Design a protein around this ligand. Structure first.
Ligand SMILES: [Hg+2]
Ligand SMILES: [Hg+2]
Ligand SMILES: [Hg+2]
Ligand SMILES: [Hg+2]
Ligand SMILES: [Hg+2]
Ligand SMILES: [Hg+2]
Lengths: 175, 176, 175, 176, 175, 176
């Protein structure tokens, strides 16, 4: 794996962690390296937020052209999750507290268009928030990336250490 | 595993169902509220939807739109299926009429599916609004139910009604 | 089975019988209780008429809210029958003397929309006639229901007896 | 089991097919009218539709739209299939053109299916009207055929033509 | 096989051969009777041309009503071929250098409408050219047909012989 | 079996791919031109399309729209699949967004498929135009490459670049 590619991965893996550590609710632990119940609407919004942080950080650091294939799963995981909010758990105002029956069964194309719209809406939103977040914290993120590329693997605590050195206090979610 | 946050959510969802059941002018059910060939008419099945929706309805009144939970999955699916049968199996919608979809739907037009979907959406929207209104209207005594629920982990309909009679509401029969 | 439910069933089973006994053509025999060739367009219209009589009587006696699940088969049987008239036996002017090929095969959505329209038209019609019929004969029907609820099972002849006592003479179709 | 009503219907349906066959300026067939690798051109298959439709055509002229029967099921299906091939297999429609649907149709646009359905509908409508017109125009001698049909239960084309020559119509050859 | 049918077949089989022998490119050999790499856009256009020659000749000689079932394969073979040009080999300007994925998979109805349009366009065109060709050479074609019906089987050379006797010089493609 | 006509076509198609590869400011590949878990970014895959399209691009510049060949089948299919993934698997289109089609697509709206198809069409159209422009701009030295190709049947990237340096173009590295 060439240094150019390592830089990408680094920015990407930092992005997730950033989202997790800021995420207003999203309960979840951490770790970070260059190698790899009942939820409410808020919880799932924040889960999407985390899932898009990789790609979000990619776009902040490299523009729309430095966007990577490495977010293939994250986009699928996030889109699935938004799709359940809309078609399974009535979490869309437009769509309403309806569930899609069965892989939908005998659903009008109009219902699908509505859903696809709302999935897009939800995802566009969480992704715009993630970019904003990466932006706001670009400088201390750069610092984290440097250490990442150097030591190859960071702990959750060091990530926080670096951010405290910048006056940003991240949520207590590490172990 | 269950955090006081999640446990509260459950309580409210559960108190929501029972509220709907006890006020439901038709629907009848075996109430026991915890944290751990026939013939139905249009009135009946509407009241079934009402009940099925109470949980989510309670979530929204109490926690706003963001507090809406995954816990209602089974509930929303049953409601939707039920309304779906009302429209496509029984002739229970005026727009669609006493027509029965050749059920998987087989060789039904996209136009018809759309009409059906709209009518399913109408039934549910209506009952959902009803459920919320009732929870709203009975927010006060319901809190009291929830407080005891969280405290003792399991309540009987009797206690539930006991709190309600205290507030001056005469809930219907239906327990054991 | 509770008395409220027995009343429903009674009205329902009376409705069919009424339709059969008045039905301008529909050849078919009878019996009535609280427990359970080559046809022309007229014949099949009347068969639909009979199939909808249950629900028709339900709506006359209890309004649109007292409508029951008990007509699940009747609606399917009737709708199937109208659907064959339209898609199998060219009995629709709008659609014309065309047959749908195979569970249709490779048929335009427009053709399906047309068919669905015509099926709806046919069924709406026969159902409006059945309601009208129940209406016109509500009083002697009430009488039949009473005896039904009392004796639990009526013969075709008694049904007629009751109607003759009202000056309505029903078609000779019983044995 | 067969009532005089039903038996009459059958007779008329059967007399309808044969009429079309005997007048059909192209189509050729083995006439025997009872109660109990090749190459066809556009003209030929049109005449096949004509024949296939004669039964129903006869029903409608004689009994109005309400007298239309189930007996034509097989007939309408064959006609429709035939016209369907004309349009989607052979290049026999001007609107659709010498295009052949990749036959189940595979990955054909909804637009194309609609065009095809319209053209199938045109062929059939046209021939149906033709069939009716002919039955109308020959109502009188056809009754006479039907009377003998009902009387003797089975007629030969010969007798059928015999009645027609008597009325002054010279039907074509095609029997045995 | 009746003489009327033999005349049809004759005209049909002559039509192909005509197309082959004139076809500006289409490499292909011949023979003719009353019984039965890497190509460019031009090559495939001409292959369609050959495939439609049968039907084309049928319509020239008998009008739109003398059109036969005998061209069932030719229309399928040609339509398949145009369909590959459009959906497989980016040979349509309207559609562009795109390939349809899999029996298409997950393709919009709009894309299919576009394709169906372009397939129709290509085929309409080649078929109008084939008719024109049959027209232009109707007289010497009649001559060929006569010999065909007489001797039942013609060689490629005789076909040419007849055309040379008319001052038309056909491409050197026989053996 | 291969006619001088067909052999020329092949040469040009092959010279087209290599041209694109050698000029491609990103894409890297194992050049050897004859007649016989990772991470890619948007820039990278665009350059892959460019390469995949070079063959056809070369065909069109040299032989016009009628000279377009069957030889590009595999090429067009790969390009299309790649762009299809860009749009529907990776969030690489602005119109569609960081949305991922639940892949066979499952229960996606006709509207979405249309958006996707349009965007796939945009990527490819753009890169196709790029490929052609480059072939156009380097028509002269490419002929020279083709002449040697037809002459010796197999060329190395080295020779290819050798001709290009002679014309005054400094192509990038990427060979062995
Ligand atoms: Hg990731
Ligand atoms: Hg629940
Ligand atoms: Hg019934
Ligand atoms: Hg028949
Ligand atoms: Hg042929
Ligand atoms: Hg290639």
């Amino acid at each position: 794996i060439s240094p150019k590619e390592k830089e990408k991965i680094a920015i990407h893996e930092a992005g997730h962690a950033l989202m997790g550590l800021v995420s207003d609710d999203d309960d979840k632990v951490h770790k970070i390296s260059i190698i790899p119940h009942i939820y409410d609407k808020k919880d799932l919004y924040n889960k999407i937020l985390v899932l898009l942080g990789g790609r979000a950080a990619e776009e902040v650091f490299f523009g729309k052209d430095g966007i990577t294939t490495g977010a293939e799963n994250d986009l699928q995981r996030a889109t699935d999750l938004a799709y359940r909010m809309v078609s399974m758990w009535g979490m869309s105002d437009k769509v309403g507290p309806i569930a899609i029956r069965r892989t939908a069964v005998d659903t009008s194309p109009d219902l699908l268009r509505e859903i696809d719209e709302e999935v897009k809406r939800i995802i566009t939103e969480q992704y715009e928030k993630a970019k904003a977040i990466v932006e706001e914290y670009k400088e201390p993120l750069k610092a984290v990336v440097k250490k990442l590329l150097e030591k190859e693997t960071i702990t959750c605590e060091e990530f926080v250490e670096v951010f405290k050195l910048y006056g940003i206090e991240l949520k207590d979610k590490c172990k």
